[PDB]
Amino acid sequence: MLSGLNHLTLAVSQLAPSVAFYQQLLGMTLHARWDSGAYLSCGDLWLCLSLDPQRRVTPPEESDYTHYAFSISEADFASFAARLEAAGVAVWKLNRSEGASHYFLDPDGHKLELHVGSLAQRLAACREQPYKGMVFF
Amino acid sequence: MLSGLNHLTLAVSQLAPSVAFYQQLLGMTLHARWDSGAYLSCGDLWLCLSLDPQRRVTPPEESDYTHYAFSISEADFASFAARLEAAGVAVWKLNRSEGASHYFLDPDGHKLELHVGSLAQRLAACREQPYKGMVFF
Ligand SMILES: OB(O)c1ccccc1
Numbered sequence: 001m002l003s004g005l006n007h008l009t010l011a012v013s014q015l016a017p018s019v020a021f022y023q024q025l026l027g028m029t030l031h032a033r034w035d036s037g038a039y040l041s042c043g044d045l046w047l048c049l050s051l052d053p054q055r056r057v058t059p060p061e062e063s064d065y066t067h068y069a070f071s072i073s074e075a076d077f078a079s080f081a082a083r084l085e086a087a088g089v090a091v092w093k094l095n096r097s098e099g100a101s102h103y104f105l106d107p108d109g110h111k112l113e114l115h116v117g118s119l120a121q122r123l124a125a126c127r128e129q130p131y132k133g134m135v136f137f
Numbered sequence: 138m139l140s141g142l143n144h145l146t147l148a149v150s151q152l153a154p155s156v157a158f159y160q161q162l163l164g165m166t167l168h169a170r171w172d173s174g175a176y177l178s179c180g181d182l183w184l185c186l187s188l189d190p191q192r193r194v195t196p197p198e199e200s201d202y203t204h205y206a207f208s209i210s211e212a213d214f215a216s217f218a219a220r221l222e223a224a225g226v227a228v229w230k231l232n233r234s235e236g237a238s239h240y241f242l243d244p245d246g247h248k249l250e251l252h253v254g255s256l257a258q259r260l261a262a263c264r265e266q267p268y269k270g271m272v273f274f
């Protein structure tokens with residue numbers, strides 16, 4: 001059967017600024033870079049950045065809610081979010097509708113998130129403060 | 138410091154067919170559903186389907202190369218691809234890289250992939266046959 005996410009590939013319009021964002025600003029590990037892409041890791045996540053002439057820099061009001069959240073500890077969350085804010089990283093959402101999260105944009109407008117907590121923890125929180133109509137299986 | 142992918146959220150135009158696709162066709166575990174979304178797991182992956190009226194059913198020619206690959210064993214790959222084919226799931230690309238890959242679309246046109254092989258396997262192949270301009274770190 002399917003066993004998890006093998007990799008996440010993000011189309012990017014300019015390779016160098018995107019590599020710098022994920023490696024320098026977000027602290028991911030850069031393994032390789034070539035004329036049209038890069039491979040990074042974030043813990044177990046394999047991230048590919050793929051140079052794509054079709055990628056547009058997209059304002060958040062023009063894209064749907066599809067987004068990619070990265071795990072961070074409770075101890076590190078606030079200072080990492082504040083560092084992104086001080087660096088001028090654009091945002092796309094303020095209301096914490098799914099727990100402790102910071103919502104920010106990559107250089108092409110990919111919707112990213114820092115989140116504290118697992119799925120199990122989110123289900124437990126939702127039992128007390130459920131989303132409208134929620135059923136648990 | 139970021140420790141991995143916390144969750145992947147896909148915006149969906151119609152919740153019921155998306156739940157059917159990820160749970161029944163793709164075999165993911167449904168943990169909860171509410172009026173505007175669902176939580177599933179696939180191995181370590183926490184997947185959220187979020188009902189979003191701004192999601193367009195998007196032809197593959199009209200979206201960029203951003204895509205989400207799920208892990209499957211080599212032994213299971215061909216029968217899973219055949220299951221998707223029986224269900225009439227559209228393919229958006231042929232495989233031309235190392236490791237088996239099947240490139241398929243979700244009901245809203247999200248670009249998905251089945252892939253066999255890790256980042257380490259890809260890097261080993263690239264070291265032997267580097268892409269144009271490739272540098273390792
Ligand atoms: O780190 B760099 O400036 C770099 C540029 C091109 C290929 C590889 C690495």
Ligand SMILES: [Mn+2]
Pocket residue numbers: 067069098101113144146
């Ligand atoms: Mn989220």
Ligand SMILES: [Mn+2]
Pocket residue numbers: 007009204206250
């Ligand atoms: Mn891929």
